Swiss-Prot record:
Its cofactor is Mn(2+). Phosphoenolpyruvate carboxykinase activity is regulated by acetylation and glucose levels. High glucose concentrations favor PCK1 anaplerotic activity by triggering acetylation on Lys-82 (K91ac). At low glucose levels, SIRT1-mediated deacetylation of Lys-82 promotes the cataplerotic conversion of oxaloacetate to phosphoenolpyruvate. Phosphoenolpyruvate carboxykinase activity is inhibited by 3-mercaptopicolinate. It is found in: Cytoplasm, Cytosol; Endoplasmic reticulum. Changing K82Q: 3-fold decrease of affinity for phosphoenolpyruvate. This is Phosphoenolpyruvate carboxykinase, cytosolic [GTP].
Length: 603
């Protein structure tokens, strides 16, 4: 009985299974106190102030209630080498590669994990508060939503989870005796500290391990206080656990923005888009369109949970409550709506600070007044002419979604938004045109499976680091949507903002100008005759894209399709799928590969 150590809420108030989860891990981790979070403003503000007292965060006095965390440089991002999924059989988690090393996930046996767990968690919260975070992934009481309980010894995690999820007492009441995902996190630094504390940032790099146990409905993360490793809703639940739940239950959990686009006529559609990290989902999701009369509105910028309803519409919710966005590169011109969203109630991690209490980073495109100096993310003075950057490259802001000036009116609708188009894309300097459309659902699944991005690494569906289970079975799951009764299969497109000429400059300007590409997609969904058939799919007809105001864009280079390039491309796709997917590659994906190779051979 840990009732004596409860400093907020009550163990008697908890659902029975939530109580078991809290007490079992209180016995294991031996926290000094147990704090059951209520999600209130008072809790949040007080916890922020406490972190301020401790040197854990700094207040940014230029803004309304904004904050800055600088981490230990050993704990700066997700670490894929220490990210694992536990299942009885390896094959259910990853396909058995021919070459012996999988790029599609990392399996650990139950036996090996149990040893690793026992070497980490016993007594790991000594002298710290265990916070109990009840949270909803998705709008409260949406039929597509799912509930988690996160245990953590990090106030930074509590504050960040309040922004990125719906958390507090209302979630506990909505949960009742229903099922939930068990999320256990520790920074791995029990008191008294055995090792030195760097930058007031508790972490344990040597023992860092982020584990997923889909069959036990558990996420167990040790040693890292950062982002995807500690905010257990962000990737661990949102993609890895949820993709497995999605496979079991007949839905999809994807690394996709959701946006609503409205033409000059006022006709509206919703699109989903899967790009890898560093390929601009957040820019597109809250785009300021350069084309007159067009309006883009944001539903989400990172995670899409999608399920075909009884009418056959692909319904998507954003399961997040905020944007955990990359800070460097974000400017007034690249993303004006992000700049507006993050002005208040926002936590920044690993960015630079200006002498007047403002935030700064590479590519911010806001010159400072003379006299204004900059402190870097490493807490040292920094001039533009210095070699190292002022902000870490994967530094982040964590901001409420409700503050976005163009947040979609249906962004919290419990039924979700009807998706009519799915877009894939990444960074390809050569060969791949600006935009094309898949010839069918089966081709579209192949296009997702074939995705690559800048060293050009493969990233099928932008999910390479996030697959909850066997990628081959994931492909089969996607393909099975075509045999679902009444399913209205969205049109699939592939984009490339990053094609370059032989001098290495971008052939397309991008950003708000990408609204010109979205227009074409909109029309194609409407059934307009604006498409020319090519070996790789439908591209826009000559003069079908609005290029007014761009001057002379080199269209023939931008839309050029080379036999020699695509020959090499199909061969490389073949070898990858053969190696990495092998016996689990669906028949239909092999067929699309064979078909594309054949169409290219006839060029
Ligand atoms: N050239 C060009 N670059 C772009 C465009 N859109 C975004 N970018 C670049 O993409 C980067 C920002 O994208 P990120 O925010 O890292 O991508 P994301 O998909 O949101 O990544 P996660 O948040 O990690 O999922 C910056 O380097 C931008 O300059 C575009 O239209 N053209
Ligand atoms: Mn103290
Ligand atoms: Mn993003
Ligand atoms: Mn992401
Ligand atoms: Na710090």
């Amino acid at each position: 009985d840990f009732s004596a150590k409860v400093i907020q809420g009550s163990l008697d108030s908890l659902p029975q299974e939530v109580r078991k989860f809290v007490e079992g891990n209180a016995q294991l981790c031996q926290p000094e106190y147990i704090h059951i979070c209520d999600g209130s403003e008072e809790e949040y503000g007080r916890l922020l102030a406490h972190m301020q007292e401790e040197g854990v965060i700094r207040k940014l006095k230029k803004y309304d209630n904004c904050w800055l965390a600088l981490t230990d440089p050993r704990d700066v991002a997700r670490i894929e080498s220490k990210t694992v999924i536990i299942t009885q059989e390896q094959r259910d988690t990853v396909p058995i590669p021919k070459s012996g090393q999988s790029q599609l996930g990392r399996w650990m046996s139950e036996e090996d994990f149990e040893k690793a767990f026992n070497a980490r968690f016993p007594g790991c919260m000594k002298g710290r508060t265990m916070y109990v975070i009840p949270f909803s992934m998705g709008p409260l009481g949406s039929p597509l939503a799912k509930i988690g309980i996160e245990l953590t010894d990090s106030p930074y995690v509590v504050a960040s989870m309040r922004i990125m999820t719906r958390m507090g007492t209302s979630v506990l009441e909505a949960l009742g005796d229903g099922e939930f995902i068990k999320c256990l996190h520790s920074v791995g630094c029990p008191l008294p500290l055995k090792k030195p504390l760097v930058n007031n940032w508790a972490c344990n790099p040597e023992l860092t391990l982020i584990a997923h146990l889909p069959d036990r409905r558990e996420i167990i993360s040790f040693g890292s206080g950062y982002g995807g490793n500690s905010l257990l809703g962000k990737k661990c639940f949102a993609l890895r656990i949820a993709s497995r739940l999605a496979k079991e239950e007949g839905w999809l959990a994807e690394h996709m923005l959701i946006l609503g686009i409205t033409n000059p006529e006022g006709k509206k559609k919703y699109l989903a888009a899967a790009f890898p990290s560093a390929c601009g989902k957040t820019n597109l999701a809250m785009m300021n369109p350069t084309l007159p009369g067009w309006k883009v509105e944001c539903v989400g910028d990172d995670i899409a949970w999608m399920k075909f309803d009884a009418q056959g519409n692909l319904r998507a919710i954003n399961p997040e409550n905020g944007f955990f966005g990359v800070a460097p590169g974000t400017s007034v011109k690249t993303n004006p709506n992000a700049i507006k969203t993050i002005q208040k109630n926002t936590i920044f991690t690993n960015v630079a600070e200006t002498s007047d209490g403002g935030v700064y980073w590479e590519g911010i495109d806001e010159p400072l007044a003379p006299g204004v100096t900059i402190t870097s993310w490493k807490n040292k003075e920094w001039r533009p002419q210095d070699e190292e950057p002022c902000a870490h490259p994967n530094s982040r802001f964590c901001t409420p979604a409700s503050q976005c000036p163009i947040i979609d009116p249906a962004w919290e609708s419990p039924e979700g938004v009807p998706i009519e188009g799915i877009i894939f894309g990444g960074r390809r300097p050569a060969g791949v045109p600006l935009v094309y459309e898949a010839l069918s659902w089966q081709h579209g699944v192949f296009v997702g499976a074939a995705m690559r991005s800048e060293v050009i690494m493969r990233d099928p569906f932008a999910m390479r680091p996030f697959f909850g289970y066997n990628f081959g079975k994931y492909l089969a799951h996607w393909l099975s949507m075509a045999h679902r009764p009444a399913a209205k299969l969205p049109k699939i497109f592939h984009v490339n903002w990053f094609r370059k000429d032989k001098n290495g400059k971008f052939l397309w300007p991008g950003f708000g100008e990408n609204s010109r590409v979205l227009e074409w997609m909109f029309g194609r969904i409407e059934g307009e005759d604006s498409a020319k058939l090519t070996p790789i799919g439908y591209v826009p007809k000559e003069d079908a894209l609005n290029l007014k105001g761009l001057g002379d864009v080199n269209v023939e280079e931008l839309f050029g399709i080379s036999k020699e390039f695509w020959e090499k491309e199909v061969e490389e796709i073949d070898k990858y799928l053969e190696d990495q997917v092998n016996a689990d590659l669906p028949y239909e994906i092999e067929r699309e590969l064979r078909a594309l190779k054949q169409r290219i051979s006839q060029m």
